[PDB]
Amino acid sequence: MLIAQRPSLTEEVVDEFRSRFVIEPLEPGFGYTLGNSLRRTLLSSIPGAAVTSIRIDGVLHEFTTVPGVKEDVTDLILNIKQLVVSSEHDEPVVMYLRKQGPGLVTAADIAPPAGVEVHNPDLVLATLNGKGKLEMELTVERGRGYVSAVQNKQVGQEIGRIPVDSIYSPVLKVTYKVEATRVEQRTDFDKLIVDVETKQAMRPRDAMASAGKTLVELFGLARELNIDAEGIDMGPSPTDAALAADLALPIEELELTVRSYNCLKREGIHSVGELVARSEADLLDIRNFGAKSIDEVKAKLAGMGLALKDSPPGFDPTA
Amino acid sequence: EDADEELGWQERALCAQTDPESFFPEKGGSTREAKKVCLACEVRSECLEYALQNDERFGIWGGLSERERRRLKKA
Amino acid sequence: MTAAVKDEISRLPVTRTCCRKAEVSSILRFAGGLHLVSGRIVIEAELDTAMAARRLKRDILEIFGHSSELIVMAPGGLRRGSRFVVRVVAGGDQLARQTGLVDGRGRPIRGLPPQVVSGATCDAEAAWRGAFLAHGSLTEPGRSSSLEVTCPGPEAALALVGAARRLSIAAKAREVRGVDRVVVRDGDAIGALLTRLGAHESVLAWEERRMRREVRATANRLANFDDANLRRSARAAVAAGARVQRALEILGEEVPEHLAAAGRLRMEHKQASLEELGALADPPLTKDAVAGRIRRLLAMADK
Amino acid sequence: EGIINPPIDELLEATDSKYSLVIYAAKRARQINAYYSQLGEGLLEYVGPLVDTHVHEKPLSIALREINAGLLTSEAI
Amino acid sequence: EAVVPADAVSFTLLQEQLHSVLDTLSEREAGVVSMRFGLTDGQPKTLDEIGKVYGVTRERIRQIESKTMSKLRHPSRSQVLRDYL
DNA sequence: GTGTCAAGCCAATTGGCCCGGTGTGTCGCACGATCTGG
DNA sequence: CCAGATCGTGCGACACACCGGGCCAATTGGCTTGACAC
Ligand code: SF4
Ligand SMILES: [Zn+2]
């Protein structure tokens, strides 16, 4: 069947890393079929990297306070958790923080090894007073979604290891809603609004693209059961739908040198499509050839951007 | 269109889009302009039929003057 | 020439709603068209005027409730016109249906819409304002002038003639080579009409020009007004000499012998006719040679 | 957006109470409507609107916007 | 037997439209029609009186009335008045 | 005294439909110049 | 290359383009006159 009204997706930017996408007009229903799916795929189906556990020093589990630092263990763990990192190593990778003396120990004082990066060096991790020392170790690894310290507790016991919650997913908060939008035609056509908020690393548009790709793969998994199965046909794919105005037009050219147009008219070319592809060999072999005529059929041929030997659409002439 | 209704052949008269005074000449006026206009109107046959049925001897209908209508009506 | 008058007309403020609707309908009926696409309709309007495009855009949006585009691609297609093409895509079908271009559940309408016709006289004034903005020409075939508007068909020409009649004016439809227009030959009638449209400064300038110039007694008649018309074509050749001085400002681009000689003969014998000039060539060349030479001199000095 | 624009609190900063604001806005709306109705005919004392409008906007909304913006004054006669 | 406001406004609009349409005609034709149907005073008049005021023959006055009557009943000016009938 | 029809005539239009000068410009094409390209 | 497309050049054809000048036609608009029905 034919949808008869292709939905469109439009983005709005609220902050540096906060966006609001609108999809409309969706058929009756269909605002809930792909709203929860998009939200969950965004929040749990994008790879990321994060800290798994920390080793503050040789002495800990004195949760009252870590000597030398103003804050307490829980605040330090939360500050570490706010850290955003990117990694390429499948195995866990250990980096060190070795700030000393009084002052404010921040993320820029970390010493990541090769293959990992910290995207917000300006984050503050703690404050040291009275010439204190903070010799900390951070283990970073990759994953998906939110996995708590539970499922990260290690049966093997180490004196200084403390596991922390891991926020792998780049997107931090996603919400969605649906509304009625149609007036001209019948009402009950759904408009879907999704608000996405991520972290410093990735922009919302990339997250949306990745989620869409993953869902497309997931549902192609089921569409493969019987490829010759009818569904709801969107129809006019925007790219070729727009490019049909200039790529497959029967008129070879509108404004160009009359000499070249006349030469190429009575030589086996009627629509620009027959010329766009396989251009060099056709222009060379046959009697119709030109040296500088290329300038008239290569540069000025691109009415809205086109190169030759390009695959032409509509290979069947609508005679 | 979506009108779904037609009042009649009056709505489809070409002369509506033209000088209504040109179809009632005066003081030796001519007739070529109105007669030429009528020859493109689609409802010319209906206009002539209506004029004959109402038998009015003023103005020009269906592309014919009053004298032409009299001559046609003679038979 | 006309551009100043058209600017004065367009800059004029119009208030009555009926007049604005009539003007929009007329402009859309003369210098605009429908371009069927994807089974629906889109409206384009190509205007060769500075701001009348903004006027049409604002009027459409305000009185009819639609949003335009105003793409400034030149209408001639060569980019030289620098004239504006305003487009309406979404809802343009409703604009076409409720402006009068297409109605009755059928083909478009050949002449002016039935609503502009059969209205108050001010409505006819608005119809002329729109029509004269769409196309137009304020020609001077001599010292006395003649307006001109190339209507898109005999029906439109006759409708404009009828609308002129209601304004007390005298108008004459005409056709040549299959293209037809409306002409008002009498100069006094020309001023009378141009006053109604709204322009006054242009009216004053035209009146002073024609009044001073026309008062040149030449006994009328043939060989006495005909010689006046030879002298008027000689003044047209004086305008061609002004074009030649424009070519001189361009330097003429080191022209060859033939065109230089033709231009020199034309300038020195500023009153000699083309045939007379040709008789002056050392190898006697016909009026045709001088005609072609001036044609090509003008073509070269176009830049 | 809609009938809750402009807010009543902002409007009440330009008058004494709701009762006076009602008459103030109503008189301005009548002036605007009369200006529209007789706009084509001979000029009259009526003026406005003094703010950007829409295609077919209720004159009362325009009057309230003008009052909120501070482009009107109410005397006592 | 009361005045239905819709009908009253419709009649007023009809009167205005009739006056507007009769204005497009010439002064003489509109005047003869008005004084024949008594639009201005509601008093129908005979042809001879109309000729007397116009100083023409009774039959000539009858001629003018027919011409205008057909002019209004034409497929160029009728549609402005078709709805009200 | 009124309300139709049925002829009849004259008259100022437009309009057809031309005569009579050159004159001009659009085409309608030859030769030839120049250029771009088989 | 060097030959046709495009245009220079040029000669002509011809359709106006006046710009008036006039004889006749359509038709026909207006008016009247008579005649016939109330
Ligand atoms: S034939 Fe009748 S309806 Fe058609 S244009 Fe002529 S008068 Fe009008
Ligand atoms: Zn008006």
mmCIF file of N, CA and C in Angstrom, chain C residues 9-59:
data_model
loop_
_atom_site.group_PDB
_atom_site.id
_atom_site.type_symbol
_atom_site.label_atom_id
_atom_site.label_comp_id
_atom_site.label_asym_id
_atom_site.label_seq_id
_atom_site.Cartn_x
_atom_site.Cartn_y
_atom_site.Cartn_z
ATOM 1 N N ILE C 9 3.440 54.710 -9.446
ATOM 2 C CA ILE C 9 2.193 53.969 -9.282
ATOM 3 C C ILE C 9 2.306 52.994 -8.118
ATOM 4 N N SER C 10 3.376 52.195 -8.100
ATOM 5 C CA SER C 10 3.500 51.148 -7.089
ATOM 6 C C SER C 10 3.650 51.734 -5.693
ATOM 7 N N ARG C 11 4.448 52.795 -5.550
ATOM 8 C CA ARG C 11 4.656 53.391 -4.237
ATOM 9 C C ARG C 11 3.384 54.011 -3.676
ATOM 10 N N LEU C 12 2.377 54.234 -4.508
ATOM 11 C CA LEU C 12 1.145 54.841 -4.035
ATOM 12 C C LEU C 12 0.490 53.944 -2.986
ATOM 13 N N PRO C 13 -0.130 54.517 -1.949
ATOM 14 C CA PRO C 13 -0.837 53.684 -0.969
ATOM 15 C C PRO C 13 -2.267 53.387 -1.384
ATOM 16 N N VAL C 14 -2.668 52.121 -1.297
ATOM 17 C CA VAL C 14 -4.010 51.679 -1.654
ATOM 18 C C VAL C 14 -4.672 51.108 -0.410
ATOM 19 N N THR C 15 -5.927 51.488 -0.185
ATOM 20 C CA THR C 15 -6.623 51.177 1.056
ATOM 21 C C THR C 15 -7.819 50.262 0.856
ATOM 22 N N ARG C 16 -8.725 50.603 -0.054
ATOM 23 C CA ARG C 16 -9.961 49.845 -0.196
ATOM 24 C C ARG C 16 -9.661 48.394 -0.556
ATOM 25 N N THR C 17 -10.341 47.468 0.125
ATOM 26 C CA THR C 17 -10.055 46.049 -0.062
ATOM 27 C C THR C 17 -10.380 45.592 -1.479
ATOM 28 N N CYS C 18 -11.511 46.041 -2.022
ATOM 29 C CA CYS C 18 -11.896 45.619 -3.364
ATOM 30 C C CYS C 18 -10.838 46.017 -4.383
ATOM 31 N N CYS C 19 -10.288 47.224 -4.251
ATOM 32 C CA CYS C 19 -9.252 47.662 -5.177
ATOM 33 C C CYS C 19 -8.024 46.767 -5.091
ATOM 34 N N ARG C 20 -7.615 46.396 -3.876
ATOM 35 C CA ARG C 20 -6.442 45.542 -3.731
ATOM 36 C C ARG C 20 -6.683 44.165 -4.332
ATOM 37 N N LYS C 21 -7.858 43.585 -4.081
ATOM 38 C CA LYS C 21 -8.166 42.291 -4.680
ATOM 39 C C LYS C 21 -8.144 42.381 -6.199
ATOM 40 N N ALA C 22 -8.718 43.450 -6.754
ATOM 41 C CA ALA C 22 -8.727 43.614 -8.202
ATOM 42 C C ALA C 22 -7.316 43.754 -8.755
ATOM 43 N N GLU C 23 -6.472 44.546 -8.094
ATOM 44 C CA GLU C 23 -5.107 44.722 -8.576
ATOM 45 C C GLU C 23 -4.345 43.406 -8.553
ATOM 46 N N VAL C 24 -4.486 42.638 -7.472
ATOM 47 C CA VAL C 24 -3.800 41.351 -7.398
ATOM 48 C C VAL C 24 -4.297 40.427 -8.497
ATOM 49 N N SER C 25 -5.614 40.388 -8.715
ATOM 50 C CA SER C 25 -6.155 39.530 -9.761
ATOM 51 C C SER C 25 -5.619 39.928 -11.129
ATOM 52 N N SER C 26 -5.553 41.229 -11.407
ATOM 53 C CA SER C 26 -5.071 41.681 -12.709
ATOM 54 C C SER C 26 -3.601 41.329 -12.906
ATOM 55 N N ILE C 27 -2.765 41.602 -11.902
ATOM 56 C CA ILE C 27 -1.346 41.283 -12.032
ATOM 57 C C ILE C 27 -1.154 39.786 -12.228
ATOM 58 N N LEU C 28 -1.869 38.968 -11.456
ATOM 59 C CA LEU C 28 -1.753 37.526 -11.628
ATOM 60 C C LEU C 28 -2.268 37.078 -12.989
ATOM 61 N N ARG C 29 -3.208 37.819 -13.577
ATOM 62 C CA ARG C 29 -3.746 37.427 -14.872
ATOM 63 C C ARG C 29 -2.862 37.851 -16.033
ATOM 64 N N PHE C 30 -2.045 38.890 -15.872
ATOM 65 C CA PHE C 30 -1.228 39.349 -16.992
ATOM 66 C C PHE C 30 0.167 38.732 -16.990
ATOM 67 N N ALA C 31 0.949 38.986 -15.945
ATOM 68 C CA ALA C 31 2.359 38.614 -15.910
ATOM 69 C C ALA C 31 2.614 37.430 -14.986
ATOM 70 N N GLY C 32 1.707 36.455 -14.987
ATOM 71 C CA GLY C 32 1.860 35.291 -14.139
ATOM 72 C C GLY C 32 1.270 34.066 -14.797
ATOM 73 N N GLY C 33 1.567 32.914 -14.205
ATOM 74 C CA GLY C 33 1.118 31.657 -14.769
ATOM 75 C C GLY C 33 1.026 30.557 -13.736
ATOM 76 N N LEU C 34 0.432 29.454 -14.183
ATOM 77 C CA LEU C 34 0.270 28.240 -13.398
ATOM 78 C C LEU C 34 1.192 27.167 -13.958
ATOM 79 N N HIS C 35 1.860 26.426 -13.072
ATOM 80 C CA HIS C 35 2.824 25.402 -13.481
ATOM 81 C C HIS C 35 2.454 24.086 -12.805
ATOM 82 N N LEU C 36 1.612 23.292 -13.460
ATOM 83 C CA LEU C 36 1.191 22.021 -12.885
ATOM 84 C C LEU C 36 2.406 21.172 -12.533
ATOM 85 N N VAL C 37 2.420 20.650 -11.310
ATOM 86 C CA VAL C 37 3.531 19.841 -10.817
ATOM 87 C C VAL C 37 2.992 18.846 -9.801
ATOM 88 N N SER C 38 3.361 17.575 -9.967
ATOM 89 C CA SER C 38 2.981 16.513 -9.037
ATOM 90 C C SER C 38 1.467 16.392 -8.896
ATOM 91 N N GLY C 39 0.731 16.723 -9.955
ATOM 92 C CA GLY C 39 -0.715 16.673 -9.921
ATOM 93 C C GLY C 39 -1.375 17.833 -9.209
ATOM 94 N N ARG C 40 -0.599 18.759 -8.656
ATOM 95 C CA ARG C 40 -1.101 19.949 -7.986
ATOM 96 C C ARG C 40 -0.643 21.178 -8.766
ATOM 97 N N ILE C 41 -0.954 22.361 -8.242
ATOM 98 C CA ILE C 41 -0.733 23.612 -8.955
ATOM 99 C C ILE C 41 0.157 24.523 -8.120
ATOM 100 N N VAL C 42 1.087 25.196 -8.793
ATOM 101 C CA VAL C 42 1.934 26.223 -8.201
ATOM 102 C C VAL C 42 1.826 27.472 -9.064
ATOM 103 N N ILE C 43 1.851 28.636 -8.419
ATOM 104 C CA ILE C 43 1.636 29.915 -9.083
ATOM 105 C C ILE C 43 2.961 30.657 -9.141
ATOM 106 N N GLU C 44 3.307 31.167 -10.319
ATOM 107 C CA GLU C 44 4.482 32.011 -10.478
ATOM 108 C C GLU C 44 4.057 33.344 -11.069
ATOM 109 N N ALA C 45 4.762 34.407 -10.691
ATOM 110 C CA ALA C 45 4.497 35.731 -11.236
ATOM 111 C C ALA C 45 5.824 36.417 -11.499
ATOM 112 N N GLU C 46 6.081 36.733 -12.765
ATOM 113 C CA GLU C 46 7.329 37.345 -13.207
ATOM 114 C C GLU C 46 7.060 38.820 -13.470
ATOM 115 N N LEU C 47 7.709 39.692 -12.706
ATOM 116 C CA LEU C 47 7.526 41.130 -12.825
ATOM 117 C C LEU C 47 8.855 41.789 -13.156
ATOM 118 N N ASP C 48 8.810 42.732 -14.096
ATOM 119 C CA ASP C 48 9.986 43.457 -14.572
ATOM 120 C C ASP C 48 10.127 44.808 -13.887
ATOM 121 N N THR C 49 9.740 44.885 -12.619
ATOM 122 C CA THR C 49 9.666 46.143 -11.898
ATOM 123 C C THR C 49 10.372 46.011 -10.557
ATOM 124 N N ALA C 50 10.804 47.156 -10.027
ATOM 125 C CA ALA C 50 11.649 47.160 -8.837
ATOM 126 C C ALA C 50 10.936 46.540 -7.642
ATOM 127 N N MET C 51 9.840 47.158 -7.205
ATOM 128 C CA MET C 51 9.194 46.797 -5.951
ATOM 129 C C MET C 51 7.792 46.236 -6.121
ATOM 130 N N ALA C 52 7.194 46.346 -7.309
ATOM 131 C CA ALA C 52 5.863 45.785 -7.507
ATOM 132 C C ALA C 52 5.809 44.325 -7.087
ATOM 133 N N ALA C 53 6.945 43.624 -7.131
ATOM 134 C CA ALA C 53 6.981 42.262 -6.611
ATOM 135 C C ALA C 53 6.667 42.241 -5.122
ATOM 136 N N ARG C 54 7.263 43.155 -4.355
ATOM 137 C CA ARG C 54 6.928 43.244 -2.938
ATOM 138 C C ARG C 54 5.464 43.611 -2.751
ATOM 139 N N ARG C 55 4.945 44.507 -3.592
ATOM 140 C CA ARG C 55 3.546 44.901 -3.474
ATOM 141 C C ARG C 55 2.628 43.705 -3.673
ATOM 142 N N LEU C 56 2.870 42.924 -4.726
ATOM 143 C CA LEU C 56 2.055 41.743 -4.973
ATOM 144 C C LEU C 56 2.194 40.737 -3.840
ATOM 145 N N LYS C 57 3.417 40.541 -3.344
ATOM 146 C CA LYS C 57 3.638 39.603 -2.248
ATOM 147 C C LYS C 57 2.843 40.008 -1.013
ATOM 148 N N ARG C 58 2.982 41.269 -0.600
ATOM 149 C CA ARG C 58 2.283 41.746 0.583
ATOM 150 C C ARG C 58 0.778 41.659 0.400
ATOM 151 N N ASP C 59 0.277 42.066 -0.769
ATOM 152 C CA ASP C 59 -1.160 42.027 -0.992
ATOM 153 C C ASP C 59 -1.681 40.599 -0.932
#
